[PDB]
Amino acid sequence: QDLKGVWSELSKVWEQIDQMKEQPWVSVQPRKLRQNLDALLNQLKSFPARLRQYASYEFVQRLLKGYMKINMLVIELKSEALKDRHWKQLMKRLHVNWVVSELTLGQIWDVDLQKNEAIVKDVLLVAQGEMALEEFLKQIREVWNTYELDLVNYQNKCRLIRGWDDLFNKVKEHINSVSAMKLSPYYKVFEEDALSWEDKLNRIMALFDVWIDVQRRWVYLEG
């Protein structure tokens, strides 16, 4: 009857939902997920009103609407900011036991993301801050492994160094940034790297402060 038909349509919709949920979270595309959600919503809306008045159909429709409204949270979680430490942290807060390799969209959809929106947003902001700090560390490393001294010939007698001003500005910029990076409590992660980089920068600062004076005195006395 009509009840049997709506039950069959419900079974088909649930099978489609399970099939799209079997996709592992590593291989899930948020944009394609949203497109498939919209397609499923359009398919549901194609049902007759008599089948649409059933309670189970309403429950599945509101579940898919909840998935639609949390699609933005899925996009935000599907960043690289999460690392795995923040994933471990949210695992600890939400008291769920998953496997990172075996992670798929299904278990996390079973977890009420809307109810835990505050925790999820806090995790996201923490991840963004830690990524900001880590990207700053990557930037300092890559600029300080690629920086070269601007050597220039001098009277065919030696090869001196110019560009003291720009190098000194870079060094002071980086030392002040690292020193200020002790605050912003996210510093509790990646602290030994920060200390080593600060020590190296201070060594550079002192060595080149002595170097500039030695070069100036030597060129003056040479003349």
Question: Which residues within the stretch 112-171 sit at the binding site for another protein (CB under 8 A)?
Answer: 125, 128-129, 131-133, 135-136
Is residue 77 within 8 A of residue 33, CB to CB? The reply is no
Rounded Cα gap, residues 201 and 172, in angstroms: 9
Q: Which residues contact 96 (CB under 8 A, 6 or more apart)?
A: 107, 111
* Window 82-101: contact mask with another protein (x via CB under 8 A): x-------------------
Q: Quick check: 176 binds another protein (CB under 8 A)?
A: yes
Size of residue set near another protein by CB under 8 A: 21
SS3 of residue 103 by DSSP: coil
Nearer to another protein, 58 or 166 (CB): 166
Q: Quick check: 30 binds another protein (CB under 8 A)?
A: no
Dihedral of the alpha carbons of 176, 148, 199, 129, in degrees to the nearest 10: 50
Which of 100-108, 111-119, 183-191, 199-207 is the region at the interface with another protein (rule: CB under 8 A)? 183-191
Nearer to another protein, 186 or 197 (CB): 186
Rounded Cα gap, residues 33 and 105, in angstroms: 10
For the chain, list the strands marked E by DSSP. 151-154, 158-161
Tell me 80's DSSP state.
S
Residue from 102, 184, 191, 219 touching another protein (CB under 8 A): that is 184
Residues that bind another protein (CB under 8 A): 31, 79-82, 125, 128-129, 131-133, 135-136, 173, 176-177, 180-181, 183-184, 186
